Amino acid sequence: MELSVYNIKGEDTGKKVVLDDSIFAIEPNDHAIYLDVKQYMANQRQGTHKAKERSELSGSTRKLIRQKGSGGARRGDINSPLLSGGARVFGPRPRNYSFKLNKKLKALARRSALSYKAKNNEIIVVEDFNFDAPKTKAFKAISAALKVGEKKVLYVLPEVNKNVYLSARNLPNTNLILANLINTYTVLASKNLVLTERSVAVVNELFKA
Amino acid sequence: PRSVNHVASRAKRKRILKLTRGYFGARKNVWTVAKNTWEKGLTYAYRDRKSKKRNFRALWIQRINAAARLEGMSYSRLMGALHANGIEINRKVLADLAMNHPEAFRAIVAKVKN
Amino acid sequence: MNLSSLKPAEGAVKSRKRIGRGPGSGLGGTSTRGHKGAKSRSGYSKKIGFEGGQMPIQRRLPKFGFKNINRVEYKPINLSVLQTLSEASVEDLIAAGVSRNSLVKILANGTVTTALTVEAHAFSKTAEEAIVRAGGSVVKL
Amino acid sequence: PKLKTNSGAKKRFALTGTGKIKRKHAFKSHILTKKTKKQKRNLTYFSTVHKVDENAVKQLLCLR
RNA sequence: AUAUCGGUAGGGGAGCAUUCCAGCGACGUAGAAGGGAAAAGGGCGACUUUUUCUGGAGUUUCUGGAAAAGCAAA
RNA sequence: UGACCGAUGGAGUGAGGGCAUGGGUGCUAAGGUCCAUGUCCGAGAGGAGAAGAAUCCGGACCACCGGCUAAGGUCCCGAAA
RNA sequence: ACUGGAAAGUAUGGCCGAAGAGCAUGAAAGCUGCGUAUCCGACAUAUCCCUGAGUAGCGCGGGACACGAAUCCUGUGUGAAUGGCGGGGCCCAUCCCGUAAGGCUAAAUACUCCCGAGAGACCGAUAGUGAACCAGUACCGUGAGGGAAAGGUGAAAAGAACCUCGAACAGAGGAGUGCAAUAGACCCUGAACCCGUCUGCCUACAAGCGGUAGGAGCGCCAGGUGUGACUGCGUGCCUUUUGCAUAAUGAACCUACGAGUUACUGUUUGUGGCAAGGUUAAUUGUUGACAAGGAGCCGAAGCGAAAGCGAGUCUUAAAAGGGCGCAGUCACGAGCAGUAGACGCGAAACCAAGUGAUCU
RNA sequence: GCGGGGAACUGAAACAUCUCAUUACCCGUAGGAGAAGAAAACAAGUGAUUCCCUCAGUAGUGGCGAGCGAACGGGGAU
RNA sequence: UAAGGGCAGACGGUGGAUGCCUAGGCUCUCGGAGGCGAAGAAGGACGUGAUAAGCUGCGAAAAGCUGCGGGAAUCGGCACA
Ligand SMILES: [K+]
Ligand SMILES: [K+]
Ligand SMILES: [K+]
Ligand SMILES: [K+]
Ligand SMILES: [K+]
Ligand SMILES: [K+]
Ligand SMILES: [K+]
Ligand SMILES: [K+]
Ligand SMILES: [K+]
Ligand SMILES: [K+]
Ligand SMILES: [Mg+2]
Ligand SMILES: [Mg+2]
Ligand SMILES: [Mg+2]
Ligand SMILES: [Mg+2]
Ligand SMILES: [Mg+2]
Ligand SMILES: [Mg+2]
Ligand SMILES: [Mg+2]
Ligand SMILES: [Mg+2]
Ligand SMILES: [Mg+2]
Ligand SMILES: [Mg+2]
Ligand SMILES: [Mg+2]
Ligand SMILES: [Mg+2]
Ligand SMILES: [Mg+2]
Ligand SMILES: [Mg+2]
Ligand SMILES: [Mg+2]
Ligand SMILES: [Mg+2]
Ligand SMILES: [Mg+2]
Ligand SMILES: [Mg+2]
Ligand SMILES: [Mg+2]
Ligand SMILES: [Mg+2]
Ligand SMILES: [Mg+2]
Ligand SMILES: [Mg+2]
Ligand SMILES: [Mg+2]
Ligand SMILES: [Mg+2]
Ligand SMILES: [Mg+2]
Ligand SMILES: [Mg+2]
Ligand SMILES: [Mg+2]
Ligand SMILES: [Mg+2]
Ligand SMILES: [Mg+2]
Ligand SMILES: [Mg+2]
Ligand SMILES: [Mg+2]
Ligand SMILES: [Mg+2]
Ligand SMILES: [Mg+2]
Ligand SMILES: [Mg+2]
Ligand SMILES: [Mg+2]
Ligand SMILES: [Mg+2]
Ligand SMILES: [Mg+2]
Ligand SMILES: [Mg+2]
Ligand SMILES: [Mg+2]
Ligand SMILES: [Mg+2]
Ligand SMILES: [Mg+2]
Ligand SMILES: [Mg+2]
Ligand SMILES: [Mg+2]
Ligand code: NA
Ligand code: NA
């Protein structure tokens, strides 16, 4: 589609920008989005959980009581799960929660998320800016001028921009990401999406078709 | 993660123990005795809901028999005459009239005593 | 949608089966196992190829044949596929449009009717005759 | 671990194009003569695995 | 519209509760969870709401995700 | 009627029993035993037979303080001459 | 400013942010304390012609190699060559490859008693280590060895001066402290089984799983609630069985604990992505995410034991005379299977290394 | 890590070849790693060791039973 | 008449469930390091304090001695002095 660029203080400079239709104007795939978000969370998982089975308890393997003649229930060793302080049967084991999604499926999910944003009109394009020194107040002023301070916002940058990252580090509902590292979860997690002039070009050239 | 449903598990027992109130001895409050008593009572209740209709019909028939024998007829003869004359008043209404409205019962009897 | 209203496709997910958890589930008590015998015990497995003591079929049928450890197998490419490739060059065996470092053999399934210059490892007699009738060339290497 | 193929089955059975399993014929009596020359039925023609006996040869060959 | 709806072994379908997680909404010293009493509700049910006493600091809705995910008898 | 047949996913069962009929065996004994044809209990509640797994009547979606019948009954216990 | 015992809470109104991680503070703190982002800092002390002989080879008996008798090893007995010799799965010839009987060598690989910095859709006191506390302790055994239970006053000890009953704090009733003592030392919360007191109704002519369906009277708070004279029906439950009230099995009761799980490989199916193609594995770059990695795997032609031929092929001297042949792939969820202890508890036994003749 | 000795229960629905397994266990002895390593090699052109993914549950082996199970080649780390 | 008993409610007792809490566990990641000992080890015995020492620390110089660097008002280890 076509979008109007805003400057640092939220005035329409008049310069217009074009976004790829095959990226921002498709019919989104809900199942693809669901799968990609599930994969992202499962890949964030750290499965470091374990309980002790019968073979790893510390008690001896001696038979506690003789088999016949005592008058009570027959008993084996002390590590039995029927006894208090005994084995944990079918407890957790350490696990790897990663699973595979097709590359084309993941690309389609990314395009679907971007198209959802573009359709719901939560994408705005600002000019590229630099900071001489890290200034949280300057970044806050930019966000308030762009009117993205009420809710969660994601900025997409084309390069490192150490000063900008330091300025945005301490603000609560703001996130920063490079254009080439865009993913479906990060796009969907934020209410508003602020692209820069060069970020539009990078996204268009890299995630097209 | 570890999941134990302590509160739900206890609440399930406490709800049934509220219904076992009034029983005799351990059957009112001891869980495995009270639960056993409660279900047998539920089977009894299912059977008794069926047998209640039979019992009430028998009571109506006995009361109608008494009133008809006061009027000089038997229950079977009165019912035969009623069905021949084709009136559709049921046994509950007839017994209620017999016990509480004897003049109305006399009117019914005189209509079909021809 | 967003992260707060995620939804899978209808019928894409399904709850697993849990046994031994009461009478209402229909899978409690004996837990789908039946009553007694070997198959109801923990740790039962099937001996594959075991038929209760009768001589198994993989022991009462005979062994047959032998395999060649130096076997040349060609890849069958047909004249209809050759026509399809030719229709959007003449000198064939491009193979970049399909095999991957293998030996090719041309077979007769459709027709050619167009002058080609087909090169392949091997040919069928009907394939060579069809190429000649269509007015083409065969190079065998 | 991966499923292992039964060695005797892999030496006795083969697959066809439609997925049917072909096999050789065992003799009734393997001493020819005193058996009619119609023993070409079990001596010349490969047969197929019966559908009832199928899935057992499949599990033997790792469900292939 | 008509028909059908007793069930052991067993096959199939649809759901409730529990612990933790993400997102979105909320509640709390003007009283959270838990404990006692009472009342109401659910095609049906697993269960869920509301009032009050005790208690004195945490809890919870919806959608999706994952399981140390439910006892009456060994 | 509708579930007969193909192909595929999942099974359970492979200790049966009573009654009637045709038989073998036994002693023209057994609530015996072995087959065949039906049926019921198994897995089936309700009604009559005093009380009975399979004899007679009858297949329970839930509710009702409505009506008609089946087997079998109508002096009282106990509904109806 | 409000509520509160106490604000960090609520509502205004400000300020810092390269610091909105966290912990503590009388309730939940970016601005109260310790901290955090960032910057700075070490007197020492550490760390960075010649060419391998009891050899090659060989006989007998064995072993290791995926291999249960080519290669490699050797207990026993033998024993060369100096282009020669060895190998290419028995044995010979040609061919090809290599140069034994001397030695050394980093990297990529395995592991954690210990030290430091971190993390968890891991546990929260019958859980998690046997051990949150006095734990390998108490206790048991000649010995080797076996092996527990046990956390919580309160914000702050302010941990109750003094009075009364009593021989005494044995205990309690007050007073006082405290938001609260029904927070009083076993002290947060304080359930059940089990044990009492009071109040209401019933009960000394009555007979069976103790309920269920009817139904007077009495008694409480305005149509609900407690009890229940009297009437009908009714041989618990689980398991195992052809069949159980069974005099077949099983449980004293309550609370808590307790049994189809996970990994890999197949196969079927629900839903998806690409589609005559589908898909990457290990790994590599830039910063878990993006990008690269096509090796490999399945599909795309079959028939034949095979040479082979090919929409044919096999059988035949020859024949359709006969047999077999003329949209997939990659995932996600679910069912089933195999391999792992594989739904849980239970033998009698077998083997290995030790401890015991203080009894006999 | 290397080396010297070395079971049995179990599976094969009994059991003896086979399996469990060159495991458990006993004993000796290093280092920060150890072992291996520079062709009397594989093969039918590559070029010392080691490790990962494939080849592949394939070639073979086996009371040809239960089972066991490579290498060449290719892609990498170095 | 209730000797006693039954049911319900209220309030207690006992017991220590539940809820909330905890640095005590569990599983890992990254970086180091991979030994101690005849100059006497690991592991122990006996001592050592103002007041008995149960732990901790230390060793007849015995909850400790000396020097250099850091730092600035309390300190004299823990089991409620
Ligand atoms: K009789
Ligand atoms: K009567
Ligand atoms: K602070
Ligand atoms: K308190
Ligand atoms: K508290
Ligand atoms: K109490
Ligand atoms: K009664
Ligand atoms: K007995
Ligand atoms: K002696
Ligand atoms: K070395
Ligand atoms: Mg043992
Ligand atoms: Mg445990
Ligand atoms: Mg479980
Ligand atoms: Mg019980
Ligand atoms: Mg069933
Ligand atoms: Mg049961
Ligand atoms: Mg059983
Ligand atoms: Mg049986
Ligand atoms: Mg069975
Ligand atoms: Mg077992
Ligand atoms: Mg019916
Ligand atoms: Mg049904
Ligand atoms: Mg309150
Ligand atoms: Mg909670
Ligand atoms: Mg949910
Ligand atoms: Mg559980
Ligand atoms: Mg329980
Ligand atoms: Mg049998
Ligand atoms: Mg039989
Ligand atoms: Mg009989
Ligand atoms: Mg007879
Ligand atoms: Mg049965
Ligand atoms: Mg039946
Ligand atoms: Mg009957
Ligand atoms: Mg009638
Ligand atoms: Mg105030
Ligand atoms: Mg508080
Ligand atoms: Mg413990
Ligand atoms: Mg005294
Ligand atoms: Mg209180
Ligand atoms: Mg208390
Ligand atoms: Mg009398
Ligand atoms: Mg009396
Ligand atoms: Mg019997
Ligand atoms: Mg009976
Ligand atoms: Mg028994
Ligand atoms: Mg008993
Ligand atoms: Mg009994
Ligand atoms: Mg019990
Ligand atoms: Mg055996
Ligand atoms: Mg109480
Ligand atoms: Mg001295
Ligand atoms: Mg100094
Ligand atoms: Na089901
Ligand atoms: Na009394």
Side-chain angles (χ1 to χ4, degrees), chain A residues 1-14 17-149 151-209, chain B residues 1-47 49-93 95-113, chain C residues 1-72 74 76-83 85-86 88 90 92 95-97 99 102-110 112 114-128 130-132 134-141, chain D residues 1-27 31 38-39 41-42 46-50 52 55-63:
Chain A
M1 35 197 58
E2 187 259 25
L3 275 186
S4 89
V5 176
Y6 302 84
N7 65 345
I8 273 298
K9 57 171 67 198
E11 310 141 348
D12 201 354
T13 165
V17 70
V18 182
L19 316 97
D20 203 290
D21 271 339
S22 74
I23 300 173
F24 289 93
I26 76 167
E27 172 41 8
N29 200 312
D30 277 1
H31 195 61
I33 281 162
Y34 163 92
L35 285 166
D36 219 2
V37 168
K38 201 164 125 283
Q39 207 221 31
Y40 181 89
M41 294 314 274
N43 288 349
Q44 297 328 109
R45 268 195 102 142
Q46 162 183 328
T48 51
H49 40 52
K50 192 179 168 128
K52 266 162 177 67
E53 290 195 283
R54 201 173 145 155
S55 40
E56 37 209 23
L57 280 201
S58 50
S60 70
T61 59
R62 205 222 281 103
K63 196 179 167 64
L64 285 177
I65 318 144
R66 80 229 207 243
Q67 169 86 354
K68 311 183 58 82
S70 85
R74 52 206 185 193
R75 197 63 62 210
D77 48 64
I78 193 84
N79 299 328
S80 163
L82 266 61
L83 318 178
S84 192
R88 173 65 58 202
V89 169
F90 298 147
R93 305 198 176 149
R95 255 163 104 189
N96 197 326
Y97 289 96
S98 184
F99 65 85
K100 186 213 183 172
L101 289 180
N102 285 348
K103 278 166 190 208
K104 281 155 170 157
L105 196 275
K106 281 162 82 22
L108 166 64
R110 202 174 305 119
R111 289 194 295 274
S112 316
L114 285 174
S115 304
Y116 254 125
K117 282 263 155 305
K119 182 143 55 220
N120 274 117
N121 224 319
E122 321 165 318
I123 289 178
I124 89 173
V125 179
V126 85
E127 277 169 338
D128 268 273
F129 52 93
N130 283 279
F131 287 164
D132 269 327
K135 218 46 172 142
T136 311
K137 264 147 172 45
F139 202 97
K140 218 177 109 203
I142 293 175
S143 286
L146 262 55
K147 261 157 204 149
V148 289
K151 282 253 162 23
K152 290 214 210 338
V153 71
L154 172 69
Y155 287 79
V156 175
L157 293 200
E159 307 158 1
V160 175
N161 232 352
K162 187 179 85 116
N163 277 341
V164 160
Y165 154 77
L166 290 170
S167 291
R169 208 159 67 169
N170 209 49
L171 297 157
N173 300 301
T174 87
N175 295 278
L176 257 54
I177 197 159
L178 303 189
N180 42 307
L181 310 186
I182 276 293
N183 62 75
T184 308
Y185 182 90
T186 297
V187 170
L188 282 193
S190 277
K191 188 89 189 36
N192 285 287
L193 179 60
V194 170
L195 292 156
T196 71
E197 262 214 71
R198 315 202 260 116
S199 285
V200 171
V202 173
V203 165
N204 275 349
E205 64 141 358
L206 174 68
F207 301 115
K208 75 146 55 210
Chain B
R2 184 162 182 255
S3 149
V4 185
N5 60 335
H6 284 125
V7 171
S9 200
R10 201 88 189 253
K12 194 200 251 251
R13 289 169 255 162
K14 289 190 275 203
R15 268 188 304 258
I16 291 158
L17 283 165
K18 273 287 156 195
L19 296 181
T20 57
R21 279 189 288 187
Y23 292 1
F24 187 92
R27 288 181 185 264
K28 75 165 96 55
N29 69 309
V30 177
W31 164 241
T32 43
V33 184
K35 188 203 198 190
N36 193 93
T37 303
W38 179 60
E39 322 212 305
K40 194 99 170 135
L42 288 179
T43 72
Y44 286 150
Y46 183 89
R47 178 212 53 205
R49 281 197 300 276
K50 303 257 193 250
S51 291
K52 178 180 26 169
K53 300 132 169 91
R54 317 173 186 175
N55 291 319
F56 270 102
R57 187 166 157 119
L59 179 69
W60 304 328
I61 281 156
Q62 294 179 94
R63 296 199 171 155
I64 291 160
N65 209 338
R69 273 165 207 282
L70 274 198
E71 268 330 282
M73 221 180 337
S74 81
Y75 167 86
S76 37
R77 266 122 53 162
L78 174 68
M79 280 303 149
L82 251 51
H83 297 141
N85 288 66
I87 65 137
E88 315 258 51
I89 286 169
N90 62 29
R91 282 144 192 85
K92 179 184 175 181
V93 169
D96 176 84
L97 292 172
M99 186 176 160
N100 302 133
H101 304 263
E103 55 301 340
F105 191 85
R106 263 161 236 141
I108 312 269
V109 162
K111 177 125 205 169
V112 317
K113 211 163 144 33
Chain C
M1 65 171 21
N2 51 87
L3 290 184
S4 77
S5 48
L6 289 173
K7 218 98 199 177
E10 202 72 47
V13 300
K14 155 180 231 199
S15 284
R16 80 193 274 166
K17 205 211 277 211
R18 303 161 61 218
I19 72 185
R21 288 302 184 279
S25 69
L27 312 153
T30 47
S31 317
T32 76
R33 282 234 195 202
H35 272 316
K36 276 164 160 184
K39 296 210 255 172
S40 77
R41 323 260 168 214
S42 160
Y44 174 80
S45 39
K46 167 181 190 56
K47 304 150 64 62
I48 303 309
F50 179 74
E51 333 183 338
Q54 184 178 273
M55 182 54 60
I57 182 180
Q58 81 268 9
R59 295 269 287 115
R60 67 198 188 227
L61 298 189
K63 307 199 273 176
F64 73 92
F66 86 101
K67 295 325 278 294
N68 220 13
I69 37 68
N70 49 335
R71 156 147 188 82
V72 35
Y74 292 109
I77 262 53
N78 296 263
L79 294 176
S80 270
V81 177
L82 221 46
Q83 266 258 21
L85 180 36
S86 153
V90 171
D92 273 276
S99 317
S102 71
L103 291 44
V104 197
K105 213 207 154 143
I106 311 284
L107 305 179
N109 240 326
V112 212
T114 44
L116 269 40
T117 325
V118 176
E119 325 95 351
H121 290 90
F123 281 82
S124 148
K125 330 208 210 60
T126 326
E128 269 187 276
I131 293 332
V132 165
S137 311
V138 155
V139 158
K140 181 218 166 296
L141 45 88
Chain D
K2 18 170 85 175
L3 292 181
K4 287 210 167 181
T5 314
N6 189 257
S7 307
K10 99 178 156 210
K11 274 158 230 194
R12 287 174 177 81
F13 300 96
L15 256 301
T16 64
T18 58
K20 265 126 88 157
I21 309 146
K22 72 183 265 196
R23 43 92 157 197
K24 256 266 175 217
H25 261 279
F27 307 139
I31 311 179
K38 219 196 271 201
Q39 48 175 326
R41 299 287 333 161
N42 59 67
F46 279 74
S47 166
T48 183
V49 171
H50 203 295
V52 152
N55 283 340
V57 183
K58 289 287 199 223
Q59 290 228 338
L60 278 182
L61 307 161
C62 290
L63 290 100

